[PDB]
Amino acid sequence: RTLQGRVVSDKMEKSIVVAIERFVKHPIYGKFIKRTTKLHVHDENNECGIGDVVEIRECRPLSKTKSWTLVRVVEKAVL
Amino acid sequence: MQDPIADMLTRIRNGQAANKAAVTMPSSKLKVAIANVLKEEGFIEDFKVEGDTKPELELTLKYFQGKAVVESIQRVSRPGLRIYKRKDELPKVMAGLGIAVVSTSKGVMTDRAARQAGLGGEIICYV
Amino acid sequence: RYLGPKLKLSRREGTDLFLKSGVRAIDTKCKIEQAPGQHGARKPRLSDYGVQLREKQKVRRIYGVLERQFRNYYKEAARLKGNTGENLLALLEGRLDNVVYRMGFGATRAEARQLVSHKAIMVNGRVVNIASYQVSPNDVVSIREKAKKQSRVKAALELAEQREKPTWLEVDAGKMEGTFKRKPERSDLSADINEHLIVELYSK
Amino acid sequence: ALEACPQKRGVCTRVYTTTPKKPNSALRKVCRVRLTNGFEVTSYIGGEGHNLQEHSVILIRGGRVKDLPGVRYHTVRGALDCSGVKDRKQARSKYGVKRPK
Amino acid sequence: ELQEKLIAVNRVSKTVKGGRIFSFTALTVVGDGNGRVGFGYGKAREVPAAIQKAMEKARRNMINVALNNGTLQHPVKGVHTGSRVFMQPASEGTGIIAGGAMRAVLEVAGVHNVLAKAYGSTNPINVVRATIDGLENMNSPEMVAAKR
RNA sequence: GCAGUGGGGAAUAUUGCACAAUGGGCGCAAGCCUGAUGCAGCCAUGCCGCGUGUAUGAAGAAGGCCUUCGGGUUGUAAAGUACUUUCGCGGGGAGGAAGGGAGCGACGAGCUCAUUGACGUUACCCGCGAAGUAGCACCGGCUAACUCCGUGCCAGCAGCCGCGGUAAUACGGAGGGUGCAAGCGUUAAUCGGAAUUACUGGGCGUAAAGCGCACGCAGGCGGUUUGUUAAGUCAGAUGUGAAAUCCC
RNA sequence: CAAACAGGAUUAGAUACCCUGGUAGUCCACGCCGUAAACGAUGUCGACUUGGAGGUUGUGUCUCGUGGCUUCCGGAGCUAACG
Numbered sequence: 001r002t003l004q005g006r007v008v009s010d011k012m013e014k015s016i017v018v019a020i021e022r023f024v025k026h027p028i029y030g031k032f033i034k035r036t037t038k039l040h041v042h043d044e045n046n047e048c049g050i051g052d053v054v055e056i057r058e059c060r061p062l063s064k065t066k067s068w069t070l071v072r073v074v075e076k077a078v079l
Numbered sequence: 080m081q082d083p084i085a086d087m088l089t090r091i092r093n094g095q096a097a098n099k100a101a102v103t104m105p106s107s108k109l110k111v112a113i114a115n116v117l118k119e120e121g122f123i124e125d126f127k128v129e130g131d132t133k134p135e136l137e138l139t140l141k142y143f144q145g146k147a148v149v150e151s152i153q154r155v156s157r158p159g160l161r162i163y164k165r166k167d168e169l170p171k172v173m174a175g176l177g178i179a180v181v182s183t184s185k186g187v188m189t190d191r192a193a194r195q196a197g198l199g200g201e202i203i204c205y206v
Numbered sequence: 207r208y209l210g211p212k213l214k215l216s217r218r219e220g221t222d223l224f225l226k227s228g229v230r231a232i233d234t235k236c237k238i239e240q241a242p243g244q245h246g247a248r249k250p251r252l253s254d255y256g257v258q259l260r261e262k263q264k265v266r267r268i269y270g271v272l273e274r275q276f277r278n279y280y281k282e283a284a285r286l287k288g289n290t291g292e293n294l295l296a297l298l299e300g301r302l303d304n305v306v307y308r309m310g311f312g313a314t315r316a317e318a319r320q321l322v323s324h325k326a327i328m329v330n331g332r333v334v335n336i337a338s339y340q341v342s343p344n345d346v347v348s349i350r351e352k353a354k355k356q357s358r359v360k361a362a363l364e365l366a367e368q369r370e371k372p373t374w375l376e377v378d379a380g381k382m383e384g385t386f387k388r389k390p391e392r393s394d395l396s397a398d399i400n401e402h403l404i405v406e407l408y409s410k
Numbered sequence: 411a412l413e414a415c416p417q418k419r420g421v422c423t424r425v426y427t428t429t430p431k432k433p434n435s436a437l438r439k440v441c442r443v444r445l446t447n448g449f450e451v452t453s454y455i456g457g458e459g460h461n462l463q464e465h466s467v468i469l470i471r472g473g474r475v476k477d478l479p480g481v482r483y484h485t486v487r488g489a490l491d492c493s494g495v496k497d498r499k500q501a502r503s504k505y506g507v508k509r510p511k
Numbered sequence: 512e513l514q515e516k517l518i519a520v521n522r523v524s525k526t527v528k529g530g531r532i533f534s535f536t537a538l539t540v541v542g543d544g545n546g547r548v549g550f551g552y553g554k555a556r557e558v559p560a561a562i563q564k565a566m567e568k569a570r571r572n573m574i575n576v577a578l579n580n581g582t583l584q585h586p587v588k589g590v591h592t593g594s595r596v597f598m599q600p601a602s603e604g605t606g607i608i609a610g611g612a613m614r615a616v617l618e619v620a621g622v623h624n625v626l627a628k629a630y631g632s633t634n635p636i637n638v639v640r641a642t643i644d645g646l647e648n649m650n651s652p653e654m655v656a657a658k659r
Numbered sequence: 660g661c662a663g664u665g666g667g668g669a670a671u672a673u674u675g676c677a678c679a680a681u682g683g684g685c686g687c688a689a690g691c692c693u694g695a696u697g698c699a700g701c702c703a704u705g706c707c708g709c710g711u712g713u714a715u716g717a718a719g720a721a722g723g724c725c726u727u728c729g730g731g732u733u734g735u736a737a738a739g740u741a742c743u744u745u746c747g748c749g750g751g752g753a754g755g756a757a758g759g760g761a762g763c764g765a766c767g768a769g770c771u772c773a774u775u776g777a778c779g780u781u782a783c784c785c786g787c788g789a790a791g792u793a794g795c796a797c798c799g800g801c802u803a804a805c806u807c808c809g810u811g812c813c814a815g816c817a818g819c820c821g822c823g824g825u826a827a828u829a830c831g832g833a834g835g836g837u838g839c840a841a842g843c844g845u846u847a848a849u850c851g852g853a854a855u856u857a858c859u860g861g862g863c864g865u866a867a868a869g870c871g872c873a874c875g876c877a878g879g880c881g882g883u884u885u886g887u888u889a890a891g892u893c894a895g896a897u898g899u900g901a902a903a904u905c906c907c
Numbered sequence: 908c909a910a911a912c913a914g915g916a917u918u919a920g921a922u923a924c925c926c927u928g929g930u931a932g933u934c935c936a937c938g939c940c941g942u943a944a945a946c947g948a949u950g951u952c953g954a955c956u957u958g959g960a961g962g963u964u965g966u967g968u969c970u971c972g973u974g975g976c977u978u979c980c981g982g983a984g985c986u987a988a989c990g
Contacts, residue, residue, distance in 0.1 A: 093955050174585030416847035
């Protein structure tokens with residue numbers, strides 16, 4: 001699966017957390033609600049920096065918290 | 080504005096109340112598409128693109144003794160809460176007398192026109 | 207069933223229901239045309255609920271059926287298509303005990319119910335002893351070959367001669383048989399009932 | 411009744427008499443009962459006469475006595491120690507009275 | 512000819528300098544059954560006097576309901592005072608489903624089938640007024656066409 | 660654990676019959692094991708079916724009741740006549756179940772033939788055949804169904820409004836009547852009406868209801884034209900959406 | 908000037924009203940609180956819907972037109988009624 005998000009942190013090495021956000025209708029009201037999730041994606045090349053809107057795909061579990069890897073960078077920067 | 084379609088609709092509702100010959104409303108393809116059904120259905124004489132520099136839609140309203148051609152007209156689908164109806168969901172305004180304009184992939188059409196084509200969409204408003 | 211003085215029910219309902227000697231000048235409704243009791247004289251005061259109640263009452267009393275099945279049959283006829291009122295009588299008129307009565311095998315519905323229970327009546331050959339049996343069109347209702355001798359049916363069928371039968375029916379006094387042509391419409395039936403009133407009562 | 415139970419047993423604490431309210435006047439027979447529910451409420455004693463002592467122990471039905479504010483329950487006669495009314499030729503269903511020969 | 516239906520009658524009492532003077536009110540519905548309706552509500556010191564006076568008033572104010580196959584031309588929602596009445600055409604076999612107030616007015620109206628319901632105030636006097644008003648606003652495609 | 664005992668509670672059962680049938684474990688098989696299950700018992704706890712009779716029978720018994728005592732009412736209702744004849748008795752007596760073995764064939768495939776059953780001697784069929792239990796609740800209004808007597812704010816009734824202090828259809832009895840019927844009532848518990856949280860369906864100056872004001876974070880929302888993407892949204896196809904249930 | 912309070916009166920009693928005194932307080936500086944029929948008891952912005960009359964302020968071809976502000980009367984309409 002592919003997920004789009006922002007690089008909210010590049011503190012760790014080879015590890016970048018992507019803040020993916022989505023919009024879903026409320027099961028009762030139906031009005032769209034905002035929901036986000038942080039995913040620790042792998043980045044061996046430490047190519048992606050903070051502010052980068054990258055794509056994320058499911059991959060072989062690098063660690064317990066990391067099960068995703070950086071595929072491609074959408075845009076350059078957006079702080 | 081926030082909901083141009085509602086504005087236009089209101090500007091005609093308030094214009095007819097004062098029995099004005101014509102009324103202006105900021106142009107927009109969607110608006111024109113709507114005005115098209117209003118003229119064909121017989122709610123308005125017609126319309127015309129006006130404006131020296133700013134595109135407007137001069138709506139020529141018409142009236143009759145006793146009742147006004149457009150007795151009622153209100154937007155049911157608003158930006159705050161959009162509404163969508165299926166082919167069988169299309170409600171009949173005043174058992175046929177009145178009609179409703181829906182926006183489908185086939186284009187803007189009335190209940191009967193949409194019912195015939197066999198498709199549903201966003202219920203723009205009721206007249 | 208009810209089982210008791212039927213000649214009193216006729217007075218209460220106001221109309222003359224055919225329970226037995228309704229033909230004779232005895233039927234109390236001929237002597238005193240007022241409901242039973244020490245108050246059948248004083249002027250009665252009926253309400254909207256009263257007219258609907260007494261209405262279905264006489265209806266059910268005619269066929270002499272319980273209030274349960276009567277209600278059950280009502281629900282059914284109300285489910286199927288077509289005017290409920292019409293269908294109603296159709297079902298009740300479909301009862302075996304009722305058919306037998308219409309055919310003349312029995313003096314009354316009560317006696318007809320007995321004949322059925324006594325296995326003295328057959329349907330398309332096989333015998334049926336259930337008064338609640340629903341007779342469909344094209345079904346032949348004749349007397350039992352063994353019962354063909356009992357004086358009771360002998361006298362009943364004898365009086366049947368020359369007597370006309372309903373359009374939805376057709377009997378053969380000779381063979382002592384009967385056939386259910388079709389479901390009787392409200393036009394065929396001449397009951398002192400106002401189907402429009404009985405349907406309102408159950409509305410509630 | 412606590413456990414939403416139709417009835418509830420209990421032991422009488424005292425079988426005294428009470429006087430109706432403003433509009434009525436009499437010596438209605440009541441009795442404080444310590445139900446198994448853990449509550450000590452007052453119940454009315456229907457009938458013209460009863461045989462409830464201190465260790466009566468009777469079942470409670472539940473019913474408010476308009477005249478006696480506080481009495482929200484009625485004692486079931488014909489059960490436990492509460493003997494059914496004597497010579498009750500009428501509504502024997504209540505007061506628990508066997509039909510005489 | 513015209514058939515009358517007694518909707519409802521009220522005792523109606525009032526305090527006056529001298530005591531209580533009773534006056535009975537009565538709602539009557541006059542109709543032939545082929546499209547004409549008539550509502551009447553007159554008072555009188557005597558019940559029958561009010562009933563008759565009512566029938567006379569009912570026949571004086573009649574409406575020509577444009578019936579179509581035992582039904583109406585289109586749904587309507589008339590709102591009299593705090594009372595509200597809604598009407599909706601229906602296929603045959605449905606029957607006149609509505610309160611005693613509206614039905615009685617619809618039966619004589621000639622209506623054979625219709626779906627209705629009472630909203631807001633349930634006042635019998637205000638609902639009958641709302642019903643008749645709704646029967647007036649009723650229009651047919653012929654009228655609308657010739658109207659436009 | 661099954662049945663059962665004692666204790667608890669308003670209250671819930673035979674320490675019964677049986678493996679042949681179906682299914683299961685082991686065995687090549689024969690066969691062994693199997694209170695799994697198939698049944699019977701107890702209890703109107705519920706549901707459905709049936710019976711306590713059918714036809715006849717006085718301008719109209721007796722008795723009770725009412726009376727302007729003229730009479731009226733309970734009534735064709737009972738008695739009585741005729742007919743059928745649930746129980747009970749006699750006889751017959753069920754479906755629910757083939758192989759192992761033996762003969763032919765190479766004791767293989769295949770074919771052929773023989774022996775054996777709980778509930779039951781019950782269901783059901785035939786014959787005989789006696790009229791052969793009914794009760795409970797309610798009758799002021801909502802609720803359909805009335806009088807007389809007793810009592811007398813006393814005794815008592817009561818879901819709410821109330822009723823009773825000497826004429827009470829709401830107290831008790833009786834006659835009568837209504838409802839239902841081996842059932843009938845009572846008590847407890849669940850549902851909507853409530854558009855009284857109102858998404859469909861609501862309100863806030865005085866009936867309950869704008870926070871005292873400002874600034875401002877997050878969040879929510881956002882003007883006109885064009886292009887790309889197209890995540891939301893919409894469309895086609897396909898996979899999934901167990902059985903049963905519900906609907907026809 | 909005036910709670911509390913000191914006395915004199917009134918009264919059935921007056922630990923009120925009336926009359927004579929009178930402390931805190933009321934006044935100033937600094938510190939404290941956060942409430943109120945903090946009421947038009949109806950928050951801000953934009954668009955739309957007859958006019959008449961009085962007033963403050965700018966402009967205009969100024970016995971009148973036009974923009975902003977402050978009142979009153981009122982079309983349609985709104986409100987249970989008042990408005």
